[PDB]
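Schema walkthrough. Field components (list of strings):
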Amino acid sequence: LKCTFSAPSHSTSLLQGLATLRAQGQLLDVVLTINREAFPAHKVVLAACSDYFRAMFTGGMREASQDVIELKGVSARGLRHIIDFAYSAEVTLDLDCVQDVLGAAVFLQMLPVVELCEEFLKAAM
Amino acid sequence: LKCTFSAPSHSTSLLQGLATLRAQGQLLDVVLTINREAFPAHKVVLAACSDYFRAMFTGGMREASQDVIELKGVSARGLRHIIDFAYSAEVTLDLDCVQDVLGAAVFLQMLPVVELCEEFLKAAM
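Field assembly_structure (string):
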């Protein structure tokens, strides 16, 4: 009588739970820094939706093991939006911030955010 | 012109990413044990879908600071299914294992699994 059952709302509920844990400052295990600005996160969450972060945290230049990692290559504002996306599946865009977000999304290999930025640009033009 | 966009596929892709990281043995930060059987996991994933694990890993219990935690009273077979559900949104049930899985889901407050066990048992009879 063996049968497999699925819970279609589970991935959404799990994502919401991850975001409430970050907001409560709980179980965090990395702080990414851009210049002097600090971005706390869960390595496993970022690794699960970006092959860039996955490579960084599961191999790496001895940064894989660090608790505080200086991130080069994107703007601080871009990184802020990308992390908030990882925990929410959403991004809030305007023409002032889209350069930062889109550049960061390409660099950090988060194609769904690239596509959302392109949708925004079609509408804003 | 300011607008929020969402990616409906993100929570599903993220869940899949978490599952592949557990399968590769990557970024794990807890081992639960039942009679010396080891169950590795990511605390933040278990905490994001069970109020029991969230209390254990974020609270003032002695367990909150332990990397290896003994789960007294809990079914080892049941725990296996519960953790696999956390990472997959699925459970595979039959009449041989369902009692273990239901009992562990109730104890560990994995509420969707309780419902799925009840649905299987209602169908089986």
